[PDB]
Amino acid sequence: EESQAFQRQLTALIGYDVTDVSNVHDDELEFTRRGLVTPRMAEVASRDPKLYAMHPWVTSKPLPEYLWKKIANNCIFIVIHRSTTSQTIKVSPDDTPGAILQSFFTKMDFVLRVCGRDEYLVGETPIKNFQWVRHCLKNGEEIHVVLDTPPDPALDEVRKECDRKFRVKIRGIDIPVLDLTVFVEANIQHGQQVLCQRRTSPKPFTEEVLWNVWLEFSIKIKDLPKGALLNLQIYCVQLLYYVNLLLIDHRFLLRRGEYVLHMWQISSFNADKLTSATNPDKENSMSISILLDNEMPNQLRKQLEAIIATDPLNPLTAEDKELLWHFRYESLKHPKAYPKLFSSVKWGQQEIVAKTYQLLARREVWDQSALDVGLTMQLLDCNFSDENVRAIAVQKLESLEDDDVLHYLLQLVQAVKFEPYHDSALARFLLKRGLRNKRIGHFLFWFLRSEIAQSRHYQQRFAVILEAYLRGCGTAMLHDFTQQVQVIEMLQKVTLDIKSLKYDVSSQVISQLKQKLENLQNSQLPESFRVPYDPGLKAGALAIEKCKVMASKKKPLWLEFKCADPTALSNETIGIIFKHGDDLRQDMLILQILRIMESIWETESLDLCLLPYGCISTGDKIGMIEIVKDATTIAKIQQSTVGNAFKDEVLNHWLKEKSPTEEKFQAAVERFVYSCAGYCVATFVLGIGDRHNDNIMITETGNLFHIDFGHIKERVPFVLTPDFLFVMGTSKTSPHFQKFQDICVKAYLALRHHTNLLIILFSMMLMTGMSKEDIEYIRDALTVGKNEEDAKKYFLDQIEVCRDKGWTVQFNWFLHLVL
Ligand SMILES: Cc1nc(Nc2cnccn2)cc(-c2c(Nc3cc[nH]n3)nc3cccnn23)n1
């Protein structure tokens, strides 16, 4: 009654009913639900109530060199507010909020909260190590803080509670609505690698096809490893339908009995092809019926080290694998060899896997090695099905601080798609970290909710994990999630309703939007809600006056909100775009990679001023986008002076008229040089550089930024046009262009220092977000095998290609958009 009503609340928060049993052939999901109770309760019990409530956002990384240059006399200023009075206090970079509050007690307990945000500066951390402080220093802003009472931890209340050979009988296949022939392929898969394959005889493709054939495999029963899949595929030759079945279940028991599995349709490698889930659509999908009733020389060391040295994508030959295995104990001494070593394992052999587990018992070097995320990511991809192998990776992730978890959270959530079982160390890890920290927990919610909303292949698994999180996140957050979900669902209806009503925005359309938003305001739209892409901000009532439908292809919503926090230092509005038509999952993955690149450059004291805008995918081809204020499209700047032909002088003239002083114009040029170089390198490595200038924007303060990363003859490495080069002062070279080339090289080489990581993140992105030939682009782009000097020239060539191409590519883009 009360418990059943709480389940409906969770179902409304999740967007999927976890109690549903219409689409299962076992109890794995229910076993996982029950299995996650312990790790949930264990973290909820162990977390510090006060620190969990205030969720301080901190880093233990050293402050970069450019930020130390912006602080003089070893002194940082903080303006402390209280009701109607505010005072400035000189604070040393090492001062703890506990010690600073004592200064505002002697010079004439409470807590320091950031003005206009749900962000607190508390706990035993020096203020230099608070993220907000670092953010303020980055943009050159004074830190405004308020002295108020700490939030009550009671608000985070949690509600109480055998030598036989393997064989499979193929009975037949049937489709309600389809003179070609058809056959069934049966594979024993372990980590993408096919252990054994058997086919059936081709029969005429009809509404029902029956075989009643025993398919005897070469691999024995005992030789079957845990996490092995029975891949069943239907070829007409082209593949049409696929479905999977774990041969050994979540209880270590061999699979037996009759199975009627509804299969998936086909639109090379894809994460969706690994799924243990069956198609929920019974009425329309193809289904299959089955029956189960059962020390080393100098030369070799040099060869071994060459194998270990190679990139993650370089494939191992039989020779390479046999060498790695034979010398596994020397291979075990190199953490970088681990992925390649565990790919040399014959997993279809009981005695070998046993030796592999005996090998993992001697993890002295691995355990003691400094954490390499790139390496750790490798062991979590589709190439590895073994629980123990994968577990040693998740162990390495344990030492990541909350700051670093946020950097890899999205990819780590997507990495769950590669897990053979619903319950896994990785899932438990994501559960643990999300429950420990409110910020990780906030983004965990949305990332998991995103896939539930649009992935039939993985919604069931992710729903079990989200229910797990929500059952321990506390009433306070549960309330915050409820206000958020209601808002986006309301505004998605408005987004789709307006799009229905040529690319010209008429009078009658703009009126209808204002009408609907006025009707929602007075109705059931909550007074305030957290911004999904920025949980620090609380948005309030809609500023309908400033709301509009933009003159675009997909006709998105331009929505603006008042800040719910009265302590806000400015009367700025929170701007959000709601859009249907772009695949914002792809945008999410690119932007997250962009934020990883910003962290990579920070290690080498660089700030290339990227603007990776906030973006949350909320469903199928729909979601929200942060509005970057005071920004315009490069094409629109060309339109205002020219019309439809391009002039180099336009961009520099635009920056001048948007500048009040020369002092701020010089800052606008320097910001452009850095930000252009930033996107030039990033887009080239990712293979998303060749772009029309409609999808490239700039702010009034000079900051260039790319948008709309969905779905990506003369070609170009990146967009460096004569109007960009005119801002630098070149038509020839300039002190700004010399600075530009100096930044590009230093940035490109800095990324190349993390080659493996970027390759894995890329590889994973294509498998979870969007062939082998598509992945191999990044190897060439990062010039794997070449030295720094040789690589420095390579990118300097790419820059010279853009100057030799000029407007040609952009001109061709312009013609392409006119049919
Ligand atoms: C990050 C960002 N900032 C924006 N800010 C501004 C600010 N002023 C005027 C116009 N746009 C707009 C957009 C944006 C985006 N962003 C994205 C990102 C992904 N898809 N679309 N799409 C459109 C379409 C029409 C107009 N704007 N717009 N994106």
Q: Which amino acid is at 377?
A: M
Region of 489 please: left (phi>0), alpha (psi -120 to 50) or beta: alpha
Q: Are 609 and 675 a contacting pair, CB within 8 Å?
A: yes
- Separation between Cα atoms, residue 439 and residue 52, nearest integer Å: 10
- Separation between Cα atoms, residue 128 and residue 137, nearest integer Å: 10
DSSP conformation class of 157: -
E-strand ranges in 19-110 read 76-82, 85-91
- Separation between Cα atoms, residue 242 and residue 264, nearest integer Å: 5
Mutate to test the pocket of ligand 1, among 533, 707, 712 (most ligand atoms within 8 A of CB): 707
Q: Ligand 1 atom 29: the closest Cα is on which residue?
A: 627
Q: Which atom of ligand 1 is nearest to the CA of 551?
A: 25
> Tokens 């292809």 — which residue?
553
- Separation between Cα atoms, residue 338 and residue 380, nearest integer Å: 12
Annotation-wise, does 101 bind a ligand? no
- Separation between Cα atoms, residue 317 and residue 322, nearest integer Å: 9
E-strand ranges in 631-758 read 631-633, 696-699, 704-706
Q: At what angle do helices 584-602 and 402-414 cross, to 10 degrees?
A: 150
Question: Which fold is adopted by the domain 295-474?
Answer: 1.25.40
What is the experimental resolution, given in Å to one decimal place?
3.0
- Separation between Cα atoms, residue 640 and residue 723, nearest integer Å: 14
In Å, how far are 1, 313, 753, 757 from 762, measured between CA atoms? 48, 11, 16, 8
Annotation-wise, does 612 bind a ligand? yes
Q: Are 153 and 50 a contacting pair, CB within 8 Å?
A: yes
Q: Which residues pair with 728 in a beta bridge?
A: none
- Separation between Cα atoms, residue 275 and residue 244, nearest integer Å: 6
Annotation-wise, does 442 bind a ligand? no
The pair of three-digit structure tokens given for residue 599, joined into one six-digit string: 């962290």
Q: Which residues pair with 120 in a beta bridge?
A: 113
Q: Which amino acid is at 733?
A: T
At CB < 8 A and 24+ separation, what contacts does 774-777 make? 775/313, 776/313, 777/687
Instruction: For 583-637, give the DSSP string.
Output: -HHHHHHHHHHHHHHHHHHHTTT---------EEEEETTEEEEE--TTEEEHHHH
Residue 402 C-alpha to ligand 1 middle, in angstroms? 30
The pair of three-digit structure tokens given for residue 747, joined into one six-digit string: 């940035």
Domain 475-629, classified CATH 3.30.1010.10, yes or no: yes
The pair of three-digit structure tokens given for residue 611, joined into one six-digit string: 């603007």
Mutate to test the pocket of ligand 1, among 585, 591, 697 (most ligand atoms within 8 A of CB): 697
Q: Which atom of ligand 1 is nearest to the CA of 584?
A: 19
- Separation between Cα atoms, residue 9 and residue 156, nearest integer Å: 17
HSE of 315, CA atoms in CB hemisphere, 13 A? 6
Instruction: For 742-761, give the DSSP string.
Output: HHHHHHHHHHHTTHHHHHHH
Burial of 524 (0-12, 13-18, 19+ CB in 10 A): exposed
- Residue 244: strand, helix, or coil: strand
Annotation-wise, does 712 bind a ligand? yes
Q: Are 209 and 173 a contacting pair, CB within 8 Å?
A: yes
Burial of 407 (0-12, 13-18, 19+ CB in 10 A): middle
- Separation between Cα atoms, residue 535 and residue 531, nearest integer Å: 5
CB atoms under 10 Å from CB of 740, counted, come to: 25
- Separation between Cα atoms, residue 156 and residue 153, nearest integer Å: 6
Residue 594 backbone dihedrals phi, psi, to 5 degrees: -60, -40
- Separation between Cα atoms, residue 415 and residue 761, nearest integer Å: 10
Annotation-wise, does 144 bind a ligand? no
Annotation-wise, does 580 bind a ligand? yes
Q: Are 621 and 588 a contacting pair, CB within 8 Å?
A: no
- Separation between Cα atoms, residue 396 and residue 507, nearest integer Å: 58
Give the residue among 732, 584, 749 at the shortest CA–CA distance from 677.
749
Annotation-wise, does 617 bind a ligand? yes
Residue 557 backbone dihedrals phi, psi, to 5 degrees: -100, 130
- Separation between Cα atoms, residue 708 and residue 315, nearest integer Å: 34
Residue 597 backbone dihedrals phi, psi, to 5 degrees: -65, -35
Question: Which fold is adopted by the domain 630-811?
Answer: 1.10.1070
Radius of gyration of the chain (CA): 29
Q: Which atom of ligand 1 is nearest to the CA of 626?
A: 1
Mark out the alpha helices in 687-734 (DSSP H runs): 722-728
Q: Ligand 1 atom 17: the closest Cα is on which residue?
A: 708
Q: Which atom of ligand 1 is nearest to the CA of 554?
A: 24
The pair of three-digit structure tokens given for residue 271, joined into one six-digit string: 């994460």
Question: 215 Cβ partners below 8 Å, 6+ apart?
Answer: 167, 168, 169, 170, 186, 198, 200
Give the residue among 416, 513, 375 at the shortest CA–CA distance from 767.
416
Q: Ligand 1 atom 8: the closest Cα is on which residue?
A: 631
- Residue 434: strand, helix, or coil: helix
Match domain 161-294 to its CATH number in 3.40.50.10600, 2.60.40.150, 3.60.21.10, 3.40.50.620.
2.60.40.150
Residue 428 C-alpha to ligand 1 middle, in angstroms? 37
- Separation between Cα atoms, residue 542 and residue 545, nearest integer Å: 9
The pair of three-digit structure tokens given for residue 7, joined into one six-digit string: 């389940």
Annotation-wise, does 610 bind a ligand? yes
In Å, how far are 80, 121, 606 from 145, measured between CA atoms? 5, 9, 28
Residue 626 C-alpha to ligand 1 middle, in angstroms? 8
Residue 450 C-alpha to ligand 1 middle, in angstroms? 21
Region of 6 please: left (phi>0), alpha (psi -120 to 50) or beta: alpha
Residue 242 backbone dihedrals phi, psi, to 5 degrees: -140, 150
HSE of 117, CA atoms in CB hemisphere, 13 A? 21
> Tokens 């995320």 — which residue?
373
Domain assignments of the chain as residue spans, ordered by start: 1-160, 161-294, 295-474, 475-629, 630-811
The pair of three-digit structure tokens given for residue 51, joined into one six-digit string: 């620190």
Enumerate residues lining ligand 1, CB below 6 A.
550, 552, 556, 577, 579, 582, 587, 613, 625-628, 631-632, 707-708
- Separation between Cα atoms, residue 288 and residue 258, nearest integer Å: 11
Burial of 101 (0-12, 13-18, 19+ CB in 10 A): middle
- Separation between Cα atoms, residue 292 and residue 257, nearest integer Å: 5
Burial of 631 (0-12, 13-18, 19+ CB in 10 A): middle
Question: 674 Cβ partners below 8 Å, 6+ apart?
Answer: 607, 608, 609, 743
Instruction: For 631-689, give the DSSP string.
Output: EEEHHHHHHHHT-----TTHHHHHHHHT-SSHHHHHHHHHHHHHHHHHHHHHHHHHT--
Residue 627 C-alpha to ligand 1 middle, in angstroms? 6
Task: State the DSSP H helix or E strand holding residue 185, giving kind and residue range, or none if neither.
Answer: strand 181-190
Give the residue among 704, 719, 725 at the shortest CA–CA distance from 649.
725
- Separation between Cα atoms, residue 766 and residue 760, nearest integer Å: 10
Annotation-wise, does 618 bind a ligand? yes
Break positions in the chain: residue before each gap, C to N over 2.5 angstroms:
108, 161, 178, 236, 267, 294, 501, 644, 712, 731, 770
Q: Which residues pair with 559 in a beta bridge?
A: 576
Q: Are 677 and 747 a contacting pair, CB within 8 Å?
A: yes
- Separation between Cα atoms, residue 214 and residue 219, nearest integer Å: 15
Give the residue among 126, 218, 120 at the shortest CA–CA distance from 165.
218
> Tokens 């750790």 — which residue?
376
Three state DSSP letters for 303-338: HHHHHHHCCCCCCCCHHHHHHHHHCHHHHCCCHHHH
- Residue 13: strand, helix, or coil: helix
- Separation between Cα atoms, residue 712 and residue 725, nearest integer Å: 25
Residue 170 backbone dihedrals phi, psi, to 5 degrees: -95, 110
- Separation between Cα atoms, residue 486 and residue 530, nearest integer Å: 12
Taking every pair of Cα atoms in the chain, the longest distance, rounded to a whole number of angstroms, is 91
- Separation between Cα atoms, residue 276 and residue 250, nearest integer Å: 12
Residue 706 C-alpha to ligand 1 middle, in angstroms? 10
Burial of 645 (0-12, 13-18, 19+ CB in 10 A): exposed
- Separation between Cα atoms, residue 93 and residue 747, nearest integer Å: 28
- The number of helices, as runs of H, and strands, as runs of E, in the chain is 32, 24
- Residue 243: strand, helix, or coil: strand
Q: Which atom of ligand 1 is nearest to the CA of 705?
A: 1
Task: State the DSSP H helix or E strand holding residue 490, giving kind and residue range, or none if neither.
Answer: helix 475-500
Residue 481 C-alpha to ligand 1 middle, in angstroms? 26
Residue 194 C-alpha to ligand 1 middle, in angstroms? 46
Domain 1-160, classified CATH 2.60.120.260, yes or no: no
Q: Are 579 and 495 a contacting pair, CB within 8 Å?
A: yes
Three state DSSP letters for 256-296: CEEEEEECEECCCCCHHHCCCCCCCCCCCCCEEEEEECCCC
- Separation between Cα atoms, residue 16 and residue 460, nearest integer Å: 8
- Residue 234: strand, helix, or coil: strand
Residue 193 C-alpha to ligand 1 middle, in angstroms? 43
The pair of three-digit structure tokens given for residue 82, joined into one six-digit string: 């209280």
- Separation between Cα atoms, residue 429 and residue 42, nearest integer Å: 12
Question: 817 Cβ partners below 8 Å, 6+ apart?
Answer: 692, 694
Q: Are 183 and 174 a contacting pair, CB within 8 Å?
A: no
Give the residue among 573, 571, 568 at the shortest CA–CA distance from 558.
573
Residue 696 C-alpha to ligand 1 middle, in angstroms? 10
Kindly tell me the sign of the dihedral angle through the C-alpha atoms of 799, 608, 413, 707. negative
- Separation between Cα atoms, residue 100 and residue 113, nearest integer Å: 13
- Separation between Cα atoms, residue 591 and residue 617, nearest integer Å: 12
| ∠ CA 647-650-652, rounded to 5° | 130
User: By what method was this entry solved?
Assistant: X-ray
Mutate to test the pocket of ligand 1, among 610, 625, 637 (most ligand atoms within 8 A of CB): 625
Q: Are 792 and 695 a contacting pair, CB within 8 Å?
A: no
- Separation between Cα atoms, residue 603 and residue 750, nearest integer Å: 9
In Å, how far are 414, 430, 450, 586, 595 from 410, measured between CA atoms? 6, 10, 11, 12, 12
- Torsion, Cα of 96, 102, 103, 108 (10° steps): 150
Q: Which amino acid is at 430?
A: L
Question: 450 Cβ partners below 8 Å, 6+ apart?
Answer: 585, 588, 616, 617, 618, 619, 623
- Separation between Cα atoms, residue 806 and residue 744, nearest integer Å: 19
Q: Which residues pair with 209 in a beta bridge?
A: 173
In Å, how far are 250, 485, 538, 761 from 566, measured between CA atoms? 52, 24, 10, 41
Annotation-wise, does 575 bind a ligand? yes
Q: Are 659 and 665 a contacting pair, CB within 8 Å?
A: yes
